[PDB]
Symmetry: C2
Subunit: 122 residues, 2 copies
């Protein structure tokens, strides 16, 4: 019977993205070939089956550096990292293939489904 | 513009609350009189002016224990901590005063405004 604040979840995500933009309390660097990206492990876990399966393991919990598969495109990863922190996906014809490839690797089923719905109406 | 995922923010907050429930990557303990509560500093900062003002300071960034004002009711605090992680506020006639007192201290303006609208509507 609790009071529902319908803007609170989007407000928290916006603030977490602002902390990321300021490098505040980011605890991991994601290396994607020649490019590197800082992030909060909790956010990565909250969005990705890959990152969830890594950091829930007490063996890997404390890793400060994650090297992604060499085949992953840094731009495709960055669009997905932006999606994690904003709820907005930069999808188009020019990147649909690399974006879907990365979302499949990161195990982000809703992005994969949306990529499959983008193809179906292309 | 970019594709909007209207459930993504809520999905991220639910997953952060599940991580809290499993004590995964919690990095602070909030001491409230005889009681203690573990949490993610990022989430506390994202929801509270108090915690944002403490942890944005490089001097205080790495604190692992925050002792709140002795007057703060642990129950009012727990209701607000649950709100931070769920977007749902447990307000009643029996706790409005302690929850409002706590939200003023924690600098959570939207909760303070809702507490002011609860009083105005009996
Ligand atoms: O769909 C299910 O059956 C299912 C239900 C609940 C659940 N719990 C959970 N708790 C905390 C986090 Cl941080 C999290 N992250 C996450 C995991 C896998 C992903 F592909 C994406 C994100 N998931 C996990 C699963 Cl796999
Ligand atoms: O009041 C304003 O005009 C204002 C506008 C934007 C802003 N930016 C911000 N970026 C990151 C985080 Cl984690 C955050 N947390 C937070 C801060 C103060 C609060 F009472 C609650 C939450 N706020 C801070 C303020 Cl103070
Ligand atoms: Cl997804
Ligand atoms: Cl608030």
């Amino acid at each position: 019977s609790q009071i529902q604040f319908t803007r609170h979840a989007s407000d928290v995500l916006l603030n977490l993205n602002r902390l990321r933009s300021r490098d505040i309390l980011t605890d991991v660097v994601i290396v994607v070939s020649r490019e590197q990206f800082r992030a909060h492990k909790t956010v990565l876990m909250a969005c990705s089956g890959l990152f969830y399966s890594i950091f829930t393991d007490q063996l890997k919990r404390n890793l400060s550096v994650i090297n992604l598969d060499p085949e992953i495109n840094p731009e495709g990863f960055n669009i997905l990292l932006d999606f994690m922190y904003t709820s907005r996906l930069n999808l188009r014809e020019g990147n649909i293939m690399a974006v879907m490839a990365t979302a499949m690797y990161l195990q982000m089923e809703h992005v994969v489904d949306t990529c499959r719905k983008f193809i179906k109406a292309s």
